[PDB]
Amino acid sequence: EEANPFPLEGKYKDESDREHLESLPEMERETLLFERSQIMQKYQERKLFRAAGR
């Protein structure tokens, strides 16, 4: 089992990370959220494959 990298609302690490991202300029925030959506897709893909291999 692999740890969920962004367990808060699917895109934040924890509350201080949320507050930090929400304080950034729009371009930076949307770039980081895009980065994280890629990380989360790969995490979820690996989780699916683990379920299928059981």
Give the contacts of 14 (CB within 8 A, at least 6 positions apart). Answer: 8
Query: Which among 14-22, 25-33, 37-45, 46-54 is the span making contact with Na ion, rule CB under 5 A?
Result: 14-22
**Are 44 and 3 in contact, with CB atoms under 8 Å apart?**
no
* Residue among 19 and 35 whose Cβ is closer to Na ion: 19
Cβ of residue 5: shortest distance to Na ion, in angstroms?
Answer: 18
Cβ of residue 19: shortest distance to Na ion, in angstroms?
Answer: 5
Query: Per CB under 5 A, does 11 bind Na ion?
Result: no
21 vs 39: CA distance, rounded Å: 16
